[PDB]
């Protein structure tokens, strides 16, 4: 079937992942193909649910890896990270940048 995968189809690959793994749906264009991973690749984040654990792409502007959607974990270099989000600026609440790029 696949590496740590319980049910697959010839066409779409893995349909159901082993207990604590995450399913990743990849577009091979056109057809969708299902992979089964121990954790999610960069761009994706791990999401745990009682029926299906799923890898979910992070659509956050200029984010590299994330905690969920709406919250970025490590931002794209050349861009400051402030409270899970990524800005050029970075307020004004009272941030500024150390020897790092993590607007305090």
């Amino acid at each position: 079937c696949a590496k740590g995968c319980e049910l697959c189809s010839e066409v779409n690959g893995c349909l159901k992942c082993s207990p604590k793994l995450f399913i990743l749906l990849e577009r091979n264009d056109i057809r969708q193909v299902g992979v089964c991973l121990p954790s999610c690749p960069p761009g994706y984040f791990d999401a745990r649910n009682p029926d299906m654990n799923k890898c979910i792409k992070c659509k956050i502007e200029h984010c590299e890896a994330c905690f969920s959607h709406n919250f970025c974990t490590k931002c794209k270099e050349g861009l400051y990270l402030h409270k899970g989000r990524c800005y050029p600026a970075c307020p004004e609440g009272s941030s500024a940048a150390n020897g790092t790029m993590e607007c305090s």
Partner: protein
């Protein structure tokens, strides 16, 4: 042509009988030279003010006289004295303002009389005296105000009558007393506001009654006396409720129309004992709290009853409903459901917008003819896996907005329609296989759609 009024077109009826068509000739009056042996005379659309300078009785062979679309204002009393063979008389679309006071009397052979589309408002009593053969009577599109009960009493041979498109506002008791032979009565498009409790008690032979398009405020209980009634219409009124045992007096009823009535309540026993009744529809009767009893009326094939407050169903409800094919109880307050197994021949079911929390095992067992099932917008927390195990003919299924988390795939393979949107806890995938022939799919999540060959970058979740 000999005796065939110049300009008119004639013909032989039976051999040597004469049929004369002088219709649409715009005659000021009728021709003086008219052959006896005439068995049919059509004078229609002819601007005829008066009859006559020289009227023509003594045409004892006249079977049928047509006098429509003429500008007649009255009829002289001796006008039709000669005609012993007159079967049908047509006097519609004239400016008659009352039934001919004596002119119509003792036409012994007269069978059908048309006095519609005039301006008649008064019907003098015994204007119909001695019409022993009269079967059919038209009095629609007139300005009547009351039932001429007195005048109608002599017509015991009447079989059909139309008092439609008038201004009749009330029906007195025994208003049609002597009319024992009457079969078809049309009172629609009137201003009937109230009618007596014994207003139809006369006519035992009545089969069809049309009270439609009127201003009734309550159910017509006079109906009780019409045992041979077959077709009944009182739609487009302002009736508010149907009483218990409303149609007890009228078995062998076949069609009943009461739509466009703001019906709020209906008695449970109101539709009992109508073995020939095939379809029942009850929309928006908010004040209904219990499922109606249908004893002795098992031949229902389509039952729809919506917009009420029905809490639950008798567990042996289906016992009363074989032959039933479509059942629609949407928009009520249903929580638990009976077996439904007894209700075979069921092909369609619509139970949407109820408050159903669970689908048990037996609740849809052995429904071999069932093709379409809608349980959308319920609060169905769980479905027993084998609930759908035994539904071979099932092709359309809608479980949208039900707070489901999982799904019973068992059985049901290759159905045509499947709708699962709004079940946000339903996240796992579903293969294209286990499901060929799906022509319509709805799903809570786009990737689940993609698993069926859709999903862009047509369903959809979104």
């Amino acid at each position: 042509l000999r005796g065939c009024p110049t300009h008119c077109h004639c013909e032989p009826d039976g051999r040597m009988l004469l049929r004369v068509d002088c219709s649409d000739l715009g005659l000021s009056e009728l021709p003086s030279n008219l052959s006896v042996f005439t068995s049919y005379l059509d004078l229609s659309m002819n601007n005829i003010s008066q009859l006559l300078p020289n009227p023509l009785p003594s045409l004892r062979f006249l079977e049928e006289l047509r006098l429509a679309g003429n500008a007649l204002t009255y009829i002289p009393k001796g006008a039709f004295t000669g005609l012993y063979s007159l079967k049908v008389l047509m006097l519609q679309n004239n400016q008659l303002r009352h039934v001919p006071t004596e002119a119509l009397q003792n036409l012994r052979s007269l069978q059908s009389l048309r006095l519609d589309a005039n301006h008649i408002s008064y019907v003098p009593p015994s204007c119909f005296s001695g019409l022993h053969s009269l079967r059919h009577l038209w009095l629609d599109d007139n300005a009547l105000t009351e039932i001429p009960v007195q005048a109608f009493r002599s017509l015991s041979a009447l079989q059909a009558m139309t008092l439609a498109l008038n201004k009749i506002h009330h029906i007195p008791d025994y208003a049609f007393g002597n009319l024992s032979s009457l079969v078809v009565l049309h009172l629609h498009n009137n201003r009937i506001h109230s009618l007596g409790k014994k207003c139809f008690d006369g006519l035992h032979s009545l089969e069809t009654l049309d009270l439609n398009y009127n201003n009734l405020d309550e159910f017509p209980t006079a109906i009780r006396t019409l045992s041979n009634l077959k077709e009944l219409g009182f739609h487009s009124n302002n009736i508010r409720s149907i009483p218990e045992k409303a149609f007890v007096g009228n078995p062998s009823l076949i069609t009943i129309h009461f739509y466009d009535n703001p019906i709020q309540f209906v008695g449970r026993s109101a539709f009992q004992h109508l073995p020939e009744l095939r379809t029942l529809t009850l929309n928006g009767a908010s004040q209904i709290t219990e499922f109606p009893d249908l004893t002795g009326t098992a031949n229902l094939e389509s039952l729809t009853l919506t917009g009420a407050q029905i809490s639950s169903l008798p567990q042996t409800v289906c016992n009363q409903l074989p032959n039933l094919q479509v059942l629609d109880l949407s928009y009520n307050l249903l929580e638990d459901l009976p077996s439904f197994s007894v209700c075979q021949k069921l092909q369609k079911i619509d139970l949407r917008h109820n408050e159903i929390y669970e689908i048990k095992v037996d609740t849809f067992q052995q429904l071999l003819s069932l093709r379409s099932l809608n349980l959308a917008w319920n609060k169905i927390a769980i479905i027993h896996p084998n609930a759908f195990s035994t539904l071979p003919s099932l092709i359309k299924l809608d479980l949208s907005s039900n707070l489901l988390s999982s799904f019973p795939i068992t059985g049901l393979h290759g159905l045509t329609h499947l709708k699962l949107t709004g079940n946000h806890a339903l996240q796992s995938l579903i293969s294209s296989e286990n499901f060929p022939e799906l022509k319509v799919i709805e799903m809570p999540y786009a990737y689940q759609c993609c698993a069926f060959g859709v999903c862009e970058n047509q369903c959809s979740p979104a």
